[PDB]
Amino acid sequence: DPTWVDMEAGDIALVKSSWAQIHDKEVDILYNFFKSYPASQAKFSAFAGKDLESLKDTAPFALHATRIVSVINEAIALMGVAENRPALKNVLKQQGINHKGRGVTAAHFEEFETALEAFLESHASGYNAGTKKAWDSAFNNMYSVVFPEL
Numbered sequence: 107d108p109t110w111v112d113m114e115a116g117d118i119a120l121v122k123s124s125w126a127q128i129h130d131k132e133v134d135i136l137y138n139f140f141k142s143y144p145a146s147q148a149k150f151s152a153f154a155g156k157d158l159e160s161l162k163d164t165a166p167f168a169l170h171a172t173r174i175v176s177v178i179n180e181a182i183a184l185m186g187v188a189e190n191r192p193a194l195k196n197v198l199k200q201q202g203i204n205h206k207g208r209g210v211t212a213a214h215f216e217e218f219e220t221a222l223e224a225f226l227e228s229h230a231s232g233y234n235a236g237t238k239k240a241w242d243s244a245f246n247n248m249y250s251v252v253f254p255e256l
């Protein structure tokens with residue numbers, strides 16, 4: 107599994123600022139994920155077997171979208187400060203523990219990354235190779251803690 111490599115401060119800023127451009131698009135982020143990975147939608151109790159076009163703009167869909175984004179928001183808020191590293195790692199570890207119980211794989215997390223990258227490329231103004239590199243570094247570090255729990 108990946109090895110943690112401390113992020114540069116500028117890369118942390120690139121993640122926080124590009125995130126801020128999409129974090130109020132929770133429903134669209136979830137829709138993009140399930141559109142790109144229908145097999146992931148099949149794992150969800152509220153969504154399996156339902157038509158994705160029907161699910162958008164319903165409360166159960168916004169509810170799950172908000173839950174995911176709540177955790178991402180917190181994790182990204184905890185980045186950049188040494189005294190917050192234990193708290194950040196505990197958020198990440200708990201998500202790994204919780205998802206282990208749901209049969210979610212390392213590749214599934216990478217699929218979520220792939221879809222988010224495409225969404226950031228579509229919606230974050232000024233997205234470029236540096237933005238991509240910064241998120242790659244953030245995901246590497248997330249995986250270093252999450253993958254061993256899966």
Ligand code: HEM
Nearest residue numbers: 146147149150151152173174177178204208210214215218
């Ligand atoms: C950064 C990525 C992700 C985050 C932040 C996240 C977060 C969450 C949260 C907050 C919940 C709600 C229950 C709880 O609070 O523990 C949840 C449930 C769930 N997640 Fe994720 N998740 C992520 C990625 C994934 C991936 C890649 C999959 C695989 C397809 C997945 C599948 C599920 C399933 C099946 C549930 C349970 C739904 C249910 O009980 O009906 N998650 N996740």
